Structure 1
């Protein structure tokens, strides 16, 4: 095993579930626009989907789906997006998925965290709903951030391993090639197009020089639902990002020579899902995400 791998095999998912939490669920017959509003209303990123006909949880609705819908059916700021307004979750699931393959990926509360970290990486999803086999009820929605936050406290207790001592280039952790980025002047629609094709959680915003001046993430997109500005995707990411409430600190960055330990502290402190690796010039060399780091500690 690994030092940290032993820990993850020990603890059940129940260990992560908070004392009292809120869970939102959507009937698949629900108008898909109303659903994305609900996610905003209740302040949650994802929700399980329930089919009354099948009496089962068929799948999960996330902000990625909102991005897929916007990009597919957006035509111009002058014409409303009919499919967003008219469709139901089941209708768009049938359109989006021609294949009958994709099942709902769930985990039991008794199952260990290691098994949970595996399943997130296997299907490459960021949401794992925890379902009790006996009751049939969905208990909690597990995420990368929840899990790393848990480990971080445990990582401090255990004796410092050599991995943490080594620098990020030596460690080879993260994605250093084929980086999806956008210009300051890039339209949101084009940015959305890039989300769909690269399937990445966030796009660094770079200037003419190559330096990162900002970051545009799938989370920033949900703001379109919030302010009901989704009808106009022609605006630049820069104008769209002005709407972020938190007055902006410079983009969170890390360096190649910096230790894995240093980085995990910076990520977990800031609660952002990824870090941007850069040259002194601020030119983007790559991305380190939670999924990368957990894939390191799950295997390595």
Structure 2
């Protein structure tokens, strides 16, 4: 019965909140882990190597001139670069010799500059860490303890994966996701396989979103272009592939790519949490009965639901 399912879900949710309010990020870190920091002087295209090389997608930056944490190197960083050299060709050398220090320079230059680098102390409750992340669409926050030092970076994914793995109450979230006003709908850009990658990459920036779905004349979801696909697109300095179509670009994707996940309005967060535990999912595209894009369920949407409710 619906109402019996509702009560079981609201209880399970309050419980998870009670969990996250009682533990600190510190409490959730491994007994021994590793942090990869990159010197501000390092070459942007060179930093692209280290990321892929160690299979990480972000890394904190340290300014040696000032002996301080210089922020978070992520994917948006590289995308900015792509739009620059694109709208400013014949400046290759300014891009090929660009350093992490100059990164802020290009960003704050042609194009709106995201001048924000959240951070939180390791002893604050985990629930508080999730709130700060719910602002920075990066969905990741560095734990900093002053003198400054980076203890670790915390991701939305690691959190959702922590709950799904340690909080049995996830088994009790059976309310169909469509009944939970969490799905993101209208205002979600899409494209076609033939669409030029720079235009898709451009869409990434603008709409300030991590992925752009690819549909057909009608609205069938065929695949998806994720901001992440940008790294491999420029491995150790590239600009050639910048003239291909999304369709062609997507062929650089590694043989080990897990694939795009979809679900429907009738799927339950129980099932969704289940899949987050079994794989590196970062979003679930919501298709209808025949496979037409209806919306998207982000980790953010999910995390936002678990903390503040629908």
TM-score, shorter chain, exceeding 0.5: yes
Compared CA separation, residues 212 and 227, structure 1 to 2 (3 A):
farther
Could you say which residue in structure 1 is the equivalent of 2:115? 102
TM-score (norm: length of structure 1): 0.89
Task: For residue 265 of structure 1, report the CA deviation from its aligned partner.
Answer: 1.8
Task: For residue 234 of structure 1, report the CA deviation from its aligned partner.
Answer: 1.2
Could you say which residue in structure 2 is the equivalent of 1:117? 130
SS at match of 1:60: strand
Q: Render the CA deviation track for 1:121-161: whole Å, top value 9, x for unaligned.
A: 1233222112233x7321211111100110012331x4855
Q: Which moved more, 1:93-102 or 1:12-21?
A: 93-102
Could you say which residue in structure 2 is the equivalent of 1:18? 30
Structure 2 residue runs without a partner (length 5+): 1-12
Structure 1 residue runs without a partner (length 5+): none
Could you say which residue in structure 1 is the equivalent of 2:144? 131
Task: For residue 284 of structure 1, report the CA deviation from its aligned partner.
Answer: 0.5
Distance 2:131 2:291 in 1: 33
- Does the alignment pair 1:83 with 2:83? no
- Does the alignment pair 1:261 with 2:254? no
Distance 2:254 2:114 in 1: 40
2:225 to 193, 206, 216: 216
SS at match of 1:182: coil
Distance 1:100 1:279 in 2: 37
Task: For residue 100 of structure 1, report the CA deviation from its aligned partner.
Answer: 9.5
TM-score (norm: length of structure 2): 0.86
Could you say which residue in structure 2 is the equivalent of 1:236? 245
2:212 to 185, 199, 203: 203
Task: For residue 198 of structure 1, report the CA deviation from its aligned partner.
Answer: 0.7
Provide the aligned C-alpha RMSD in A: 2.5
SS at match of 1:297: helix
- Does the alignment pair 1:183 with 2:195? no
Distance 1:270 1:52 in 2: 37
Distance 2:258 2:96 in 1: 36
**Contact residue 275 and residue 281 of structure 2 kept, 8 A:** no
Number of residues of Structure 1 aligned to a counterpart in Structure 2: 295
Could you say which residue in structure 2 is the equivalent of 1:35? 47
Task: For residue 3 of structure 1, report the CA deviation from its aligned partner.
Answer: 1.9
Could you say which residue in structure 1 is the equivalent of 2:104? 93
Distance 2:124 2:23 in 1: 8
Task: For residue 271 of structure 1, report the CA deviation from its aligned partner.
Answer: 1.6
Q: Render the CA deviation track for 1:155-185: whole Å, top value 9, x for unaligned.
A: 31x4855xx2211221111211111212111
SS at match of 2:142: strand
**Contact residue 177 and residue 268 of structure 2 kept, 8 A:** yes
